[PDB]
Paper text:
A fundamental and non-redundant event in this process is the binding of P. falciparum reticulocyte-binding protein homolog 5 ([name]) on the merozoite to its host RBC receptor basigin (BSG) (Crosnier et al., 2011).
To identify the R5.011 epitope, a crystal structure of [name]ΔNL bound to one R5.011 Fab fragment and one R5.016 Fab fragment was determined to a resolution of 3.6 Å, with all CDR loops clearly resolved. A high-resolution structure of unbound R5.011 Fab fragment was also determined and used, together with structures of R5.016 Fab fragment and [name]ΔNL, to provide model restraints. R5.011 binds [name] primarily at the interface between the disordered N terminus and the rigid α-helical core at residues Y155–L162, a finding also confirmed by HDX-MS. R5.011 binds to these residues and constrains and orders their conformation as they emerge from the α-helical core of [name]. The position of R5.016 in [name]ΔNL:R5.011:R5.016 is equivalent to that in [name]ΔNL:R5.004:R5.016. The structures revealed that the binding sites of R5.004 and R5.016 are unaltered (<0.5 Å RMSD aligned over 39 and 30 α-carbon atoms, respectively) by R5.011 binding. Furthermore, the binding affinity and Kon of nAbs R5.004 and R5.016 for [name] are unchanged by R5.011 binding, dismissing structural allostery as a mechanism of anti-[name] nAb potentiation.
Residue numbers in the entry:
A (entry chain E): 1 to 232
B (entry chain D): 2 to 211
C (entry chain B): 2 to 212
D (entry chain C): 1 to 141, 149 to 231
E (entry chain A): 144 to 240, 299 to 500
Write the structure that this text describes.
């Protein structure tokens, strides 16, 4: 039972610096290293750097050289990672992994070939200029072009909120079956927007009422908007 | 230093033998790690060096390769294995990762239930207009959505998002959002979205009038 | 203005600790350095570029080499374990600017295995229809212990509140983990365990709903 | 000698206002500038601003203007910092530091804008959570250990003495845990000799001052 | 290519001897001695390999990292038996404080524990094999500056920093005295039990004392076995290191010497480690005999 427990998520304005802690546990941290790999939203894994618990040595990626610093505190066996002068392309999820103590050592590393085995849950870092804003909830009413027999679709538009994420719920009666919530997509404004829809048999439309439950914890915003059909 | 996988979005079923290749730009000797990552989760180490899959890894994973190319084999796919796989280089301290191989469950080929939604009255008051074209319940993921305002093609003003996969019927759902100002929304009347899918004999057009 | 400081610095007692303060054109700014011991107020230790206040020991050296200020503490004692901040004045904004700060850690201590003492719920608590299991992990070094609970060897995750190890009087660390159960859940199992893993060595203690 | 003695810790609900005092002694109060620096629990020092102790003119850092007011009571050599419309973010240790002399330059180089003497720091705690008394339970036991569990209390600090003080060597009072509930819990354990069962009545005295809670609990082994 | 003497781990001719250790009341652990020695032998091989030449001295903590991860993996397989292991612990707990049903419970759980170890043989074997492949890879890549005059600094260093201390620790202890004092304790418990199990009839205690005494004689036998090995290997080791320390060897002779030394150490470390562990369990069960015998007051 060995684990790395990282610091809470961060929301930082561009230019500021951020420190991400990775506290290791139940192993001999002094004779092991720690790497850092970040994952932009929607993309792959990009290596950041490595830092040992023996030498206190470091290897930083050329693309990040000078802007990143990462030290180790073997008394609490915690590994830190400070990325200064944050920019929009730094918005990503940051991960720390237990590595070999001499990675970019003078010669060979045929003494520990195991890759990065133990890792951390990750720390989401959001580099955005936008201010904390609650979402605007607009209804997606079922009409005659979105009705095609005994199958009718309806939903909600959760637009212009920052940061994320949001939660959707249709009063817990239909959220058990046929709920299709789309992941957020960041707009050029720097505010997120997403749509969440549900599909119900057309017969229910006239008797069953559909109200919308949206929750945005960062702004403590909770919205209840009714989704009723429009006479068109 | 330049890692390049083979398939980006593979589609296999439970029991199949799955093989993913990982090619490189330069020479690596035996140092290529393989990792498994389910969306929304931290990665997990699978294999290191040649085929030394660290303890606790299903005894059905395997790695063969040396030089510029390698392969990751799953002898018989299990439901847990449906995730995305990555390869890593470590000949030199400057680690590099592959583009990733997402493994999807291949089900039947079903067409998308297309619905269109005009901007709500509340949004129209706020000086904004977002028109959503929803494609619901289909397979494969590959679907083409084109927007036309007064029969004219639009480009750049629309954003797409997709549900990864449904838990029960294991189909995709897609949302295409066309955003324009209220001022220019009133300058047009007919709004339509054309959907082309591998299991739609002819393109489906869903439209409405302002 | 950003003053860029390394988050932590660990040193061998008797050797010298070097804390860097980077910043745009810092060579021109007169940098100050403060010492802040746990739960205490900061104390000016280096004031001018390399000037030392009255009562600050000669070990504390301060410098302004190129684009980076360096606070060097020679022949490091255990008492030097603290957070250190650098501080400049910005002629543009008339603002005093503090650095990120650096934790200085005296690394001179030996491996100390945790001492685990697990307590079951009391009569009073079960009389109040509640059950709390208390795991007390003390005298361990270094600072990190992994706590995993078990119920008849089955892992328990829901209801674990575990502190972060706080350094003790004797310099070893102490952590306290709590598992909350209902009297029903407590009596529904043969035994509950508290497993504490430190430097790849697992210390175990088990408690049973005895009668 | 120069000494900056501040006011005691404070807990207020969001929206309320605080006024932290700073009594200065051993120096000509109006002859030296007074600064205010803040610090959240687990972060760096934040310069809030400074005040001229002769004119009373304050200078605030970016964004620190509006809800923060520096004032003086030169008669009793005391500097104040008033925070109105409190927010949870304002929960922090606030220091008052004396500013040693300074020397400006046409090119901006200087003699120092350093704080030679500081205050002990006054903690401000902003939390809508209400103050609750603690439930104390006895933890019945080559040695034996017996303790006291203090659960569901807020805020700090919660103390514990054994046998009304007579018992102070051998007592490890563990730090509090902040639970998902937002309330604190801590335990105190005393290492007891193998054959000290039935000698002195082990009584733990728990005092939670913020709620005027005083609980004396006898710790005796399980009757059965 | 060398003649390693720890080579097979899947040669069913020699039984995989499992040691049970109950250092503290209510805790249990096991060691598969073949695996312990195997793993240790390749730990000495790896270290003697990196210490032979000065250029590789520093790489020590990377070997430490590997060995630790290997150990971490072996423990993961041992924990796969925890269910049966814990099932046995509570059984002993009930047995030390029905006796036919109790003893049937003990026998069944103990046998299921060994059966468990048999189930995970392949997993343990892989973890040990990766360690052999490692040690052999390092040792195979061992070179000298002059193959006819190979240095012996690696052997000397490794012995001083890794093995010597244990030799002094063993010599400081009088293990033969420990065994004489243990026989004295066992003879005492038998005398007090036979004299106690003559007439006054109270079922519960008689059975518990007979059981603990049985366990204690088994643990004693294991202590005597290891102590015997420790004595043999202490003389052997001390007398051999003297001849491989201050000189030079031909490459082939140097490797023969390192192999031999590593095998000796491995057997020594194994039975030493087990000796101390069983010593703690013998006196742990003795404390329980003292308690039950003292608890025999009729008031």
């Amino acid at each position: 039972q060995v684990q790395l427990v990282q610091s809470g998520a961060e929301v930082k304005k561009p230019g500021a610096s951020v420190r991400v802690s990775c506290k290791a546990s139940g192993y001999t941290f002094t004779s092991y290293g720690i790497s850092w790999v970040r994952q932009a939203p929607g993309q792959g894994l990009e290596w950041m750097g490595w830092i040992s618990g023996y030498d206190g040595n470091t290897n930083y990626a050329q693309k990040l050289q000078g802007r990143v610093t990462m030290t180790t505190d073997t008394s609490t066996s915690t590994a830190y990672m400070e990325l200064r002068s944050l920019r929009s392309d730094d918005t990503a999820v940051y991960y720390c992994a237990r590595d070999g103590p001499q990675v970019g050592d003078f010669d060979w590393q045929v003494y520990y070939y195991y890759g990065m085995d133990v890792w951390g849950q990750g720390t989401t870092v959001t580099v955005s200029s936008a201010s904390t804003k609650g979402p605007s909830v607009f209804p997606l009413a079922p009409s005659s072009k979105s009705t095609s027999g005994g199958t009718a679709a309806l939903g909600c538009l959760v637009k212009d909120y920052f940061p994320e994420p949001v939660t959707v719920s249709w009063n817990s009666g239909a959220l058990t079956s046929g709920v299709h919530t789309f992941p957020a997509v960041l707009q050029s404004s720097g505010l997120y927007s997403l749509s969440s829809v549900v599909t119900v048999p057309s017969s229910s439309l006239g008797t069953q009422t559909y109200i919308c439950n949206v929750n945005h914890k960062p702004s403590n915003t909770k919205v209840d908007k009714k989704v009723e059909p429009k006479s068109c | 230093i330049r890692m390049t996988q083979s398939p980006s979005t593979l589609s296999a079923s439970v029991g199949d033998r799955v093989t993913i290749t990982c090619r490189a730009s330069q020479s690596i000797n035996t140092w290529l790690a393989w990792y498994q990552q389910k969306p929304g989760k931290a990665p997990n180490l699978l294999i290191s060096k040649a085929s030394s899959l660290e303890s606790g890894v299903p005894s059905r994973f395997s790695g063969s390769g040396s030089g510029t190319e390698f392969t990751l084999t799953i002898s018989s796919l299990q439901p847990d294995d449906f995730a995305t796989y990555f390869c890593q280089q470590y000949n030199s301290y400057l680690y590099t990762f592959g583009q990733g191989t997402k493994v999807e469950i291949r089900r039947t080929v079903a067409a998308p239930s297309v619905f269109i939604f005009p901007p709500s009255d509340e949004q129209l008051k706020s000086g904004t207009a977002s028109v959503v074209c929803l494609l619901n319940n289909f397979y494969p993921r590959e679907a083409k959505v084109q927007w036309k305002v007064d029969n004219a093609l639009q480009s750049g003003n629309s954003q797409e998002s997709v549900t990864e996969q449904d838990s029960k019927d294991s189909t995709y759902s897609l949302s295409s959002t066309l955003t324009l100002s209220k001022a220019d929304y009133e300058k047009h009347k007919v709004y339509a979205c054309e959907v082309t899918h591998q299991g739609l004999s002819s393109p489906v057009t869903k439209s409405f009038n302002r | 203005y950003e003053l860029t400081q390394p988050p932590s610095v660990s040193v061998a007692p008797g050797q010298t600790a070097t804390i860097t303060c980077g910043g745009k054109n810092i060579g021109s700014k007169s940098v100050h350095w403060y010492q802040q011991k746990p739960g205490q107020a900061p104390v000016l230790v280096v004031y001018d570029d390399s000037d030392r206040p009255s009562g600050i020991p000669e070990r504390f050296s301060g410098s302004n080499s190129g684009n980076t200020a360096t606070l060097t503490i020679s022949r490091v004692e255990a008492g030097d374990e603290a957070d250190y901040y650098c501080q400049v004045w910005d002629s543009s904004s008339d603002h005093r600017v503090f650095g990120g700060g650096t934790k200085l850690t005296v690394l001179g201590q030996p491996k100390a295995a945790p001492s685990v003492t697990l307590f079951p719920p009391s009569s009073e608590e079960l009389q109040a229809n509640k059950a709390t299991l208390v795991c007390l992990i003390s005298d361990f070094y270094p600072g990190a212990v992994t706590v995993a609970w078990k119920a008849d060897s089955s892992p328990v995750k829901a209801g674990v509140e575990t502190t972060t190890p706080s350094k003790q009087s004797n310099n070893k660390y102490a952590a306290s983990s709590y598992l909350s159960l209902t009297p029903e859940q407590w009596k529904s199992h043969r035994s509950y365990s508290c497993q504490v893993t430190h430097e790849g060595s697992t210390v175990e203690k088990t408690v049973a709903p005895t009668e | 000698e120069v000494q900056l003695v501040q006011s005691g810790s404070d807990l207020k609900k969001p929206g309320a206002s605080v006024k932290v005092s700073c009594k200065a002694s051993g120096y000509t109060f109006t002859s030296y500038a007074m600064n205010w620096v803040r610090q959240a629990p687990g972060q760096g020092l934040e310069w809030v601003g400074w005040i001229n102790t002769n004119t009373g003119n304050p200078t605030y850092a970016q964004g620190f203007t509006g809800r923060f007011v520096f004032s003086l009571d030169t008669s009793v050599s005391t500097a104040y910092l008033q925070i109105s419309s409190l927010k949870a973010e304002d929960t922090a240790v606030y220091y008052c530091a004396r500013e040693s002399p300074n020397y400006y330059d046409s090119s901006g180089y200087y003699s120092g804008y350093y704080f030679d003497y500081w205050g002990q720091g006054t903690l401000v705690t902003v939390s809508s959570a209400s103050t609750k008394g603690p439930s104390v339970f006895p933890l019945a036991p080559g040695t034996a250990a017996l303790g006291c569990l203090v659960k569901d209390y807020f805020p700090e600090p919660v103390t514990v003495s054994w046998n009304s003080g007579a018992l102070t060597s051998g007592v490890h009072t563990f730090p509090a845990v902040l639970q998902s509930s937002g309330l604190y819990s801590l335990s105190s354990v005393v290492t007891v000799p193998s054959s000290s069962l039935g000698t002195q009545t082990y009584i733990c005295n728990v005092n939670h001052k913020p709620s005027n809670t005083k609980v004396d609990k006898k710790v005796e082994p399980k009757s059965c | 290519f060398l003649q390693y003497h720890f080579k097979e781990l899947s040669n069913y001719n020699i039984a995989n001897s499992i040691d049970i250790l109950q250092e503290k009341e209510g805790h249990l652990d096991f060691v598969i001695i073949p695996h312990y020695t195997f793993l240790d032998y390749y730990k000495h091989l790896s270290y003697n390999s990196i210490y032979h030449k000065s250029s590789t001295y520093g790489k020590c903590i990377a070997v430490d990292a590997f060995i630790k991860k290997i150990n971490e993996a072996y423990d993961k397989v041992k924990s796969k038996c925890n269910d049966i292991k814990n099932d046995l612990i509570a059984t002993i707990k009930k047995l030390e404080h029905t006796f036919k049903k109790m003893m049937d419970e003990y026998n069944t759980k103990k046998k299921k524990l060994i059966k468990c170890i048999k189930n995970h043989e392949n997993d343990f074997n892989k973890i040990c094999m990766d360690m052999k492949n490692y040690g052999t890879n390092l040792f195979e890549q061992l070179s000298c500056y002059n193959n006819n005059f190979c240095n012996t600094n690696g052997i000397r260093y490794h012995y001083d920093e890794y093995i010597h201390k244990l030799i002094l620790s063993v010599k400081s202890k009088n293990l033969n005295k420990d065994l004489s004092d243990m026989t004295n304790i066992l003879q005492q418990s038998e005398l007090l039990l036979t004299n106690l199990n003559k007439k006054m009839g109270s079922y519960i205690y008689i059975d518990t004392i007979k059981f603990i005494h049985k366990e204690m004689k088994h643990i004693f036998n294991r202590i005597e076995y290891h102590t015997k090995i420790i004595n043999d290997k202490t003389k052997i080791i001390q007398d051999k290191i003297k001849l491989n320390i201050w000189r030079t060897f031909q490459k082939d002779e140097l490797l023969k010497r390192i192999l031999d030394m590593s095998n000796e150490y491995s057997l020594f470390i194994t039975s030493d480690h087990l000796r101390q562990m069983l010593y703690n369990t013998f006196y742990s069960k003795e404390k329980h005999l003292n308690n039950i015998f003292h608890h025999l007051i009729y008031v």
